[PDB]
Design a protein around this ligand. Structure first.
Ligand SMILES: [Ca+2]
Ligand SMILES: [Ca+2]
Ligand SMILES: [Ca+2]
Ligand SMILES: [Ca+2]
Ligand SMILES: [Ca+2]
Ligand SMILES: [Ca+2]
Ligand SMILES: [Ca+2]
Ligand SMILES: [Ca+2]
Ligand SMILES: [Ca+2]
Ligand SMILES: [Ca+2]
Ligand SMILES: [Ca+2]
Ligand SMILES: [Ca+2]
Ligand SMILES: [Ca+2]
Ligand SMILES: [Ca+2]
Ligand SMILES: [Ca+2]
Ligand SMILES: [Ca+2]
Ligand SMILES: [Ca+2]
Lengths: 375, 375, 375, 375, 375
């Protein structure tokens, strides 16, 4: 046991057994073509195919053209461990690296981040062990050529993988959520709110069978109302228990924040790298939390979900990437279709004036209705 | 005729006939009570009662308590010329000095402005001639004591008023405007737009009988929709003509601006000292234009109006102060009641979510309605 | 021993023995009451009472009403381990989470932080082991109802606590410090400065008996002079030694800064989240340092103190929270009274003009004294 | 009489009788030496010597080295009209152009301003008629060489001066004012305040014998207290009257502002181009007002003064430039000495801590005096 | 093995074997002289001489006078372990602590940083083990007295060093790089670009013989062209291999960024604390990356280099500090001379206009050459 607790002490210890390697897009002829080229629409490219045992320790990727031209929500990254035919990592590449939608922004989370120039640099420091090979694949599901693909995949080669190491998994999910039958009753603004004791209509962000521990969540909400999107509670069902053993209080609360915030904020383990910047909470918000000091263990299964509004009353376009380890390389739930991933239009001024018009009709159309009158 | 055209040349000319005087709140005992005190709710106070002939050349006023406590839209200033029983100036004092609602903000218009600290200083450089007396009265129509009232009324005394001088007038008007029977059809967003060839349902900001010329407009809109409030055209009917001889194209256009602006901006003769700072054009905007180089003359009458939205389709809380001169001191149209002047609540997040709810009902309540769908 | 030094490698290792649990304010009926309610003035509430062995891994708390209404320096958090009657954690809750006084501000320290909305979210990632129970109690020592109390207490349950784990302690102290008898001689501005070879009149921020290691300090100074508050040296007496084995050079210096800074600054392990923003160093400053890579070990005792100005010459309102581990759960020194914790008024303009007046008297009252003259 | 009231109409009128001329520092050899050179310490230079009748219509000046090297409060400008031996304009050149002390800042007053780069451009649009010559002289009373002096003096030549034109005057005054014998009783902070019914101890900014009208004031205060400097009332004695016919209420009030402002602000006729930017009102403030629409006429004399604090209780370093016209070219009051114009040091942190020390002594030196305690 | 992966769990573990010690500049007489004094030009001072076995866990240093007076690139820090005559750490002190050139700026890297006031505080959290002594020496190679030197060197004393600990090394290198013989062909702007398959003309930032691992790089570029400086690839030759096993794609790419960024950015492990802030990439840039989770291991040797522009085509003033551990204390490569470390002048406006002039000559000197014309 170390006599001093931190990483800096550990970094001064001599180590054995690991040899650095790097798969990169370096031009082998010595020239300027230090990128892969022309991953056309509909095409897949294996960017790294590593035999044997090792541990990925760092990934850096960037792409051309820019995010406003090539939608990073339509370029997919997949990773396959141990010669499995199924991926244990499957996500749109932007969302995997904490870049929502087709947008770009710098931030500074510890294990995964996007950096300069203005969010085009995609960086991961998650450790990704493998015993019998690793393959990383990129698929262009956009309608634009992926002109240039630059990358480093840094890894340690070893003769024998330490026997206690697991396998990295990540899964993108997305749903346009269903409003409650009585309507969007958030904050009791339109009427009485229901209870939700079961979690049955929650939005699911992980559904895992096996042994492991949960380490991260990137949450992307596109809210089509000005109302606060985040009253919904997190539910974690560990090991098939009937009642969730971890129950939360709200969505900002899960992300270590409070009172319906909409301010950009950075901590190594949690933050808001993109906030809506409009009336109320209308538009897009990205929130992250990494569970590095505080991973969620499970021995047999984990199903983790969150209400979409209090008792699932709201329509939200919700997407998530969940990150976790398992004792072996396991398959994932189904991927959302390209259709589910289609970007939604921002609710705009003509749209809201149309709301106002239907509201005036239903309030009886007095020619001096202000906009706040109750029935 | 002067050989050089500007004011600076004129300022170097020796003048005769005018003696400076000042009515002020200076403490005659020499002390610190350099203000009037305790103009209680419901009370009137004559602050200046000047006999004979003169010309007001400068007014400065400030009040305690601050604008968030004492509503400057409920403290009224009136001015009476030539011993008339009727006022030729009647307005809430904030709006007269280009401070809308109960708000405060510095700006820099040439003839009338509000200045530091943060809009509490109220300044006028309009020249206000009178032959047989001047009286300035303040009335507290608020529910708060007017604790301190500081002022300078600077004027020139003369033995005989120059015979070509007119008389300053100003009038506050306000209306919560009526939406069109087919609804608020602005931008053709909800349906087809009507024509308005008559101007009959326009918002009126001046209705003057006599000879004179129009010199200013302060325009205060509280828009309860996100839609652009300003498509409405100005109409000026001079001298009883059946068809308006001056017709405009839009409200920003009248104020020397273009394309639905919502940015703070200052020119000596026109500007936006308070902009809505919210989604679309929802909330409050103050616009001014002074007609100093370009006054609007009339010999018999002027009726000046503006559409409230294209063809008067919108509900807006509109208030205006109009400024003008006439050949003699004339009465004004009726004052809006204290009830018409009541501040309207800002349209808020619960309000708009209630709009959305009525819209969902009328679009058929599919549980995944986004918010943009058409019938 | 791990072949790779950091946390990311460790996070990819499979673990056994720990089961996640969470005590939270989730509404068990399924509804919106996801908070405790109405902890009235003078009342105590047990928010978590955990039997047996475990490790707290994460705490999140927020409260209503807001910090300008409910003083977070008057709501106390206490933690009791191993069925002890005495607390091993005792502090006002704001200061515990790095929110001084009755103020609010976001910051980003690694182990403890306050986050959005504007400092209302209170977060701890300190690990807090216990073998025979844990109890967390909140006491409302304010004059305002604690209306809503939201929380997550995330912990690992275990059948048997690892035998090398200690116990988390934290202690709030506060003192209005005594100026030196010859006056506040800082910087030799008023006269000669004394020596301090003993540390006897220092401000004490830890006084611990037992085995353990020191891990953090939150320092809150309210300085009633414009002079620099921070010339005072830190003294650490380990294991009853007569002469302190760790001696510092200044207060900014202890906090890894230099030359009397007053700029907001964030590093994971040290920073200034609230700076005085006034003339010189007048007003309030919050500084933190966490000793994560560099804990201060002790086997028998630690007494740690800092001069309040060079050789304890200054009157300062100083408050601190100290954080540490011990080999077992131990009691704390006495808590400051509610009276010691009373907020001090900011030194204001009338106050300083009164200083100037006494200065003029003592310099002989020449009618043109500028303010810099020496005797 | 013109049928349209403004300058723009007048500018479209053809004029006769005036021929443009310009005295400038243009290099007559065609080269780059488009400046005067080397006006050494103690030296005077005539920059313009114009025979006969004309009207100065525009002056632009700039100097090297920069204001932090060559003190523009120690370079004097003088103007002599009609072959008089005495100047009718006498001021330090910075203060004349609205640049206080040895500082530099852009602003935008209408008749006189300082402009880019950062206040080095000095501009006047005052009209300055003369019948029998004009001479403009610069004197370097600084200890630094005036290396380069660039200028345009634009004027109209005429065969016969219009007989109604006056003559431009300006006078710099400065005083370190005397505190009241009972001390600086401003705001009644230290004790009871006196009355001032006479104006006898006021600071005088104009003392004029003759016929004319007053057109401007630049006011420069260096306040050595944090207290508000500006409670003092303006007094104007016209034509030898025993009681001042124009009495004000406060200093900000005279400058068309209210409630002790300290924010930068620009209107054509009044403003704050330099504010103190420190605790309370400690340090330097520059305020201006031009009386262009509202000149103060006098037939025989004008003496204009302002209290230095309420009833002249404060010590302030006050300096002013007053601007006016008279019917003929007249001499000025005495100039302040170079000694009176010496820059005062800013009151600093050691100074105020010394105040605090004398205050502690007089309050009895309890070791926990906070700083607000009363006797 | 720990059941929970992070540092926070480890921090709650009781430890044995380590006793805190601190060498500091504390005044032993009790007074204000809490600094070393007067390290004159050409002088060396041992600031810490520790016998026996221990581990440095934290260093804080600050110096007077300020960085614009005393060039921190000319004050050298050296560290000697285990009684060796050669240093294993040798660098200019500013660059060692991530302060380039003679500049100052706050930043927030995890293991080494510069903090308030504005970059004067120099902080290291690298662990530095030693078995048979440690000596830290400062040498003043500047032409200015080092007036005050404040420091803490915090370390753990131990009876026996853990046998797996290595030794900290760091080395400053600098080169004014050679342009390619065909000219600076970056981006193919002036002509065809060459290949570089060997790395022979690369800029070398580490050249190490022994066993260990690489942990950091501070990179300082002064680019005398507006062109992007950073197309050059990193090459790492491990254990004497003929072909580099780690090959990169670009300089921003190595630093976890993309697309020629020039924006200030902070992540714990990489960032841009000083960017050029001028046309293109002209001037100075500082970039850092720490390899904490992802150290580069080597058993026999490491030579690490980077192209200076694509295929070493550019002239750059490049300086680096490299940080690493070895199994024992080893000597370093030669230090750059004081002459190599001389600050280069910023390319300025006269310089670039001279470029333009030579360009006009070579393009044939048409009098209307714009500046973009090709031959
Ligand atoms: Ca570790
Ligand atoms: Ca290459
Ligand atoms: Ca659902
Ligand atoms: Ca909830
Ligand atoms: Ca005119
Ligand atoms: Ca008075
Ligand atoms: Ca109407
Ligand atoms: Ca129109
Ligand atoms: Ca709930
Ligand atoms: Ca003490
Ligand atoms: Ca000290
Ligand atoms: Ca020339
Ligand atoms: Ca006096
Ligand atoms: Ca007064
Ligand atoms: Ca000391
Ligand atoms: Ca080379
Ligand atoms: Ca390259």
């Amino acid at each position: 046991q170390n006599p001093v607790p931190g990483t800096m002490y550990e970094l001064s210890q001599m180590k054995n057994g690991m040899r650095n390697r790097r798969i990169s897009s370096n031009d082998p002829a010595g020239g300027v073509l230090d990128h892969l080229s022309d991953i056309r629409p509909g095409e897949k490219r294996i960017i790294a195919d590593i035999p044997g045992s090792g541990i990925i320790n760092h990934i850096w990727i960037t792409m051309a053209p820019e995010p406003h031209v090539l939608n990073r929500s339509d370029v997919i990254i997949r990773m396959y461990w141990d010669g499995n035919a199924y991926p244990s990592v499957e996500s749109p590449i932007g969302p995997f690296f904490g870049q929502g939608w087709n947008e770009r922004y710098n931030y500074s989370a510890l294990p995964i981040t996007a950096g300069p120039a203005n969010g085009t640099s995609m960086v991961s420091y998650f450790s990704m062990p493998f015993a019998q090979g690793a393959r990383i694949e990129i698929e262009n599901q956009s309608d634009v050529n992926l002109e240039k693909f630059y990358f480093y995949v840094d890894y340690y080669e070893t003769k024998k993988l330490p026997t206690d190491l697991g396998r990295f998994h990540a899964w993108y999910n997305q749903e346009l959520t269903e409003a409650a039958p009585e309507g969007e009753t958030e904050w009791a603004v339109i009427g009485k709110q229901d209870n939700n004791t079961t979690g049955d209509r929650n939005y699911v962000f992980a559904d895992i069978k096996g042994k492991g521990h949960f380490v991260g969540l990137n949450y992307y909400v596109h809210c089509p109302s000005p109302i606060w999107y985040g009253e919904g509670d997190d539910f974690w069902f560990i090991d098939g228990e009937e009642e969730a053993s971890l129950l939360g209080t709200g969505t900002e609360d899960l992300f270590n924040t409070s009172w319906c915030p909409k301010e950009a904020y950075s901590h190594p383990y949690f933050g808001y790298p993109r906030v809506n910047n409009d009336v109320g909470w209308l538009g897009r918000t990205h929130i992250y939390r990494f569970f590095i000091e505080d991973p969620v263990f499970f021995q047999k299964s984990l199903k983790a979900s969150i209400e979409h509004g209090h008792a699932n009353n709201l329509t939200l376009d919700l997407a998530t990437v969940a990150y976790w380890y398992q004792s072996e390389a396991c398959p994932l739930p189904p991927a959302p279709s390209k259709e589910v991933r289609k970007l939604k239009p921002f609710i705009n001024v003509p749209d809201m004036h149309r709301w106002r018009h239907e509201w005036r009709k239903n309030r009886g159309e007095d020619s001096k209705l202000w906009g706040n009158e109750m029935p």
